[PDB]
Structures are given as structure tokens and as C-alpha cells.
């Protein structure tokens, strides 16, 4: 099947140049472009520029043009984009995307996107906490309880309840910066009945430490 | 090099009414040889890659439910939902390929619903955290609408200002609600220093707050 795999999340330091690739299968790489877009947090997308890997010949969004540099590898059927003397404004998320020129010239098939962070900071691995509630049962047909995802370095995060098997009722909120740190938290509603007898864990994944973490909730005393 | 508007910058409607939304090219987008406009759609959910909807201004890309219609030619053009389902709960994105590629702005689509009070849930620091020296309390206000609401924090009976963090949930596909978060975190020593923790939700469902508290030697 048509894939872009991109890489995961870059922490690097202003003033560096980065280098992410989008590794194309399940197609002929050679008869489609490869297009860039950038996406800064809560903001539009922002084409960037495209390489047409049979020949190599790119063209740029004239704003990018001193940033970045497109490559393409057609024997391992992967390009890249590489962006120079990187700064905050910089800070997205990029996309590649299958971009069907001379037919549809649609962008049909997109990569997961590689999320860029510019900043001096250290990764730091989120700490994970169970919210399970105090001794007074509250509204008790449905109880919510959650997993406060705190203090860590850079975006992103995600979380899922019991591997994803836990789907309904769940509430993942925005991550928040204070004090150069993230924190998130996540909610789900099950029935009274079915906890604390069955388990309720959330997943959290860091990939910019490579940390994994789970959370069973368990009731307090 | 081509530029690219969009309008409105978002609009609400209830499911199962119709939508309409606008792009503007600064030059035509017309082929000359062709009879084609290289111009194309793309809807955008939260946390999602781009996904391509329409393409030639009015054809549809395999997979698209019928219910998504674009039109126009030259410079103007239109994307159409009959019948908004709450799935579609997105960003949508023109684009250009007439010379390089250029998106529009974004119209984003909210979803009008019956107004729903909050369910509020408040939560201790875990025994975790406090061997760490902080200490988080959490509420969660959750499915809820419209967005707008508030919250007070109170410990012993007193209203608190700073180490208060909020954050709002993407309105649900789900539902069409809203949920809400807030932290407040101090230091393990302030946080057993006090023994009662308050959070009051003041939403328009109802005149009087939706209030939850713990004490810590509760059981
Ligand atoms: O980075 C956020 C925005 O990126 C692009 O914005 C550019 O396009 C604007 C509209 O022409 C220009 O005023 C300016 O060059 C940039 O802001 C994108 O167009 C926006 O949707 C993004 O939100
Ligand atoms: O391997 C399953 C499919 O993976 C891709 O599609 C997923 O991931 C893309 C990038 O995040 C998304 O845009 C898409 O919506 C997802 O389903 C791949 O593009 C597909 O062809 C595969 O069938
Ligand atoms: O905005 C449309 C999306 O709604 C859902 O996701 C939002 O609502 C969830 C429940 O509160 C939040 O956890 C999530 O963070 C929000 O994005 C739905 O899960 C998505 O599939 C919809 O595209």
C-alpha cells in the first residue's frame, strides 16, 4: 500500500541544520512528486517546496528559499528535506506528501508528519501520575478517572487507555508550556461496576525520549 | 506566484444543514490547453495529516463521501457539505497547482448543539507525585456546551489566582462537546500545610456552579 513514513520528533539546538527523511513504498516513486508543508502549533499549512525525483529538479516557495534544501535518493526511494541555521520560527510540523503532477496535481497520500522543536532545552521524559478519586464516591453510575502526564520535553505526547482497547468516554487535553516544561492530562468515564474489578491504564508515549509508560489506576485509601 | 484566500475564517452550523465555504485566487487558475482549474480541497481533523477531497475544483477523490461538492473556475470558488455530520468536525484547506502550490488560510467548521451542563470531577495529588515535592490537583470539566466556561479554585474556603493551568479539548466528533481541564499545582509543603480543595464550574446551563472538593484525610 502507498506509505510516507516520516521520522519522529527532532529537538535541536538553534543555529543547526536538521535532516528528516519521508521513506515512500507501494509505489512508483519516480512518476510522482514529492511535495513539503510546514504547520506551526494551532496555525495553517504552509507549502514549502517539491522535488520531482526523476530528474532531481526542485522549486521552492520563494519564502523558503534561503531554509531549506529537497533531495531525493531513488534507489532507496526516500527524500529528504534539510533545514539550515534553524531558529523558533522554524518549530513545526513537517509533512511530505505523494503530490500527483501532470494528473490530479493533488497531494493524494501524506506522511504522518515529522514535529520539529528549535530550543536549547533538554528532552526531558514525562512523569506520570494515576488520578483516581478520594474516599467520596461522587455521582457514582459512571466514575472518571485520568492520568496526569507532567513535566516534559518537547511535544509531543500521546496517550491511550488500556493498548486503545479502552476508546469511549476518553478526554486528551492539549499539552501546556510553564516553566520551559509540558504537562497534559487524560480522562476516561467508565461504569462503577467494571472498576476497580477491571484495570483502567493509560499508555503514554514520549517519542522524542523513546519512553514509554504505563499508569494503572488504582483506587487510593 | 500565486495567492490565496479563504473565507469565512470559521462558521458554525447544526448537524444535518448544508455549508458553504469560499476561495479566492489572486490569478486565474484556469489551464489554457486543458479546461481544467488546478485548484483542490483538503479537510484537516485534529491531530490528523491532510486528507484530499476534491481536486480539478469539482472532482471528487475516491473515498470522499458524495455529500462534499466544490465549484467554480477563474479565480472564485466553492466547497460545499450537504448535510453537515458532526465527523466532520475539521479544518478545510484550498490549494493552488496552477504554478507551485499555495494553500488558503483555513475555514474551520464547528458544530452547533443543546446546550449541556459539565460533569466535574476533582482529583488529589497521587501518593507519586508527593514523593517528587509538587503537588497537583486536577478537574476535570467534561462534556459540556457552548465553550465558554469557568472555573474557581478555593483552598479552605479562600479563592486562589496563581499555579492554575487550564485546557480546552477539540470539540468531540463524538457528541459535539467540549471538555475542559484545570491544575492546580503548588508544592507538596504548601499542599499539606492546607486541608481542603475546591473547584466551582460556572457554565450558562445553570445559575449556580457546579462545585466539587476533597479533604485530605477523607476516607
Ligand atoms: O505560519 C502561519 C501561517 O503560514 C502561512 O501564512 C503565510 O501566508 C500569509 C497569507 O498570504 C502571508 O500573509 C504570510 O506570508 C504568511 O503568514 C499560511 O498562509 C497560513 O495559513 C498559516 O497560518
Ligand atoms: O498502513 C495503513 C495505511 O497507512 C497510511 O495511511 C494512514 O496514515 C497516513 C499518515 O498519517 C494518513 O494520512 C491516513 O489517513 C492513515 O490511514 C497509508 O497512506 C495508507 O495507504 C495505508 O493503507
Ligand atoms: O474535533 C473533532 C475530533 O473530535 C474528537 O476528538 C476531540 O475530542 C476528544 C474527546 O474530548 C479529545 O480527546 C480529542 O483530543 C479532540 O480532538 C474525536 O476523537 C476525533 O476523532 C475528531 O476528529
Known amino acids: 500500500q502507498v506509505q510516507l513514513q516520516q521520522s519522529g520528533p527532532e529537538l535541536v539546538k538553534p543555529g543547526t541544520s536538521v535532516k528528516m527523511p519521508c521513506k515512500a513504498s507501494g509505489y512508483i516513486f519516480t512518476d510522482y512528486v514529492i511535495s513539503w508543508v510546514k504547520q506551526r502549533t494551532g496555525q495553517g499549512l504552509e507549502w514549502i517546496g517539491e522535488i520531482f525525483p526523476r530528474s532531481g529538479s526542485t522549486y521552492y516557495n520563494e519564502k523558503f528559499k534561503g531554509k531549506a534544501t529537497l533531495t531525493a535518493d531513488k534507489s532507496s526511494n526516500t527524500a529528504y528535506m534539510q533545514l539550515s541555521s534553524v531558529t523558533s520560527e522554524d518549530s513545526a510540523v513537517y509533512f511530505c506528501?505523494?503530490?500527483?503532477?501532470?494528473?490530479?496535481?493533488?497531494?493524494?497520500?501524506w506522511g504522518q508528519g515529522t514535529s520539529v522543536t528549535v530550543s536549547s532545552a533538554k528532552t526531558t521524559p514525562p512523569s506520570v501520575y494515576p488520578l483516581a478519586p478520594g474516599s467520596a464516591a461522587q455521582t457514582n453510575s459512571m466514575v472518571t478517572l485520568g492520568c496526569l502526564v507532567k513535566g516534559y520535553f518537547p511535544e509531543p505526547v500521546t496517550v491511550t487507555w488500556n493498548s486503545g482497547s479502552l476508546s469511549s468516554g476518553v478526554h486528551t487535553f492539549p499539552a501546556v508550556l510553564q516553566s520551559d516544561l509540558y504537562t497534559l492530562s487524560s480522562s476516561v468515564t467508565v461504569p462503577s461496576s467494571t472498576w476497580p474489578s477491571e484495570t483502567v491504564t493509560c499508555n503514554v508515549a514520549h517519542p522524542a525520549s523513546s519512553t514509554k509508560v504505563d499508569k494503572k489506576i488504582v483506587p487510593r485509601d | 506566484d500565486i495567492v490565496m484566500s479563504q473565507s469565512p475564517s470559521s462558521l458554525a452550523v447544526s448537524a444535518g444543514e448544508k455549508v458553504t465555504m469560499s476561495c479566492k485566487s489572486s490569478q486565474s487558475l484556469l489551464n489554457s490547453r486543458t479546461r481544467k482549474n488546478y485548484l483542490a480541497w483538503y479537510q484537516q481533523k485534529p491531530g490528523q495529516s491532510p486528507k484530499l477531497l476534491i481536486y480539478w475544483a469539482s472532482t471528487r477523490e475516491s473515498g470522499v463521501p458524495d455529500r462534499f461538492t466544490g465549484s467554480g473556475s477563474g479565480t472564485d470558488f466553492t466547497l460545499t457539505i450537504s448535510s453537515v455530520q458532526a465527523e466532520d468536525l475539521a479544518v478545510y484547506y484550498c490549494?493552488?497547482?496552477?504554478?507551485?502550490?499555495?494553500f488558503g488560510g483555513g475555514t474551520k467548521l464547528d458544530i452547533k448543539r443543546a446546550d449541556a451542563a459539565p460533569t466535574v470531577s476533582i482529583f488529589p495529588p497521587s501518593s507519586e507525585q508527593l514523593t517528587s515535592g509538587g503537588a497537583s490537583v486536577v478537574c476535570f470539566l467534561n462534556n459540556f456546551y457552548p465553550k465558554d466556561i469557568n472555573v474557581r479554585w478555593k483552598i479552605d474556603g479562600s479563592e486562589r489566582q496563581n499555579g492554575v493551568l487550564n485546557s480546552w479539548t477539540d470539540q468531540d466528533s463524538k457528541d459535539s462537546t467540549y471538555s475542559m481541564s484545570s491544575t492546580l499545582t503548588l508544592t507538596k509543603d504548601e499542599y499539606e500545610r492546607h486541608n481542603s480543595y475546591t473547584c466551582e464550574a460556572t457554565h450558562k446551563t445553570s445559575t449556580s456552579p457546579i462545585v466539587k472538593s476533597f479533604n485530605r484525610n477523607e476516607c
Open positions: 506528501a505523494r503530490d500527483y503532477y501532470g494528473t490530479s496535481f493533488a497531494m493524494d497520500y
Open positions: 490549494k493552488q497547482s496552477f504554478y507551485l502550490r499555495t
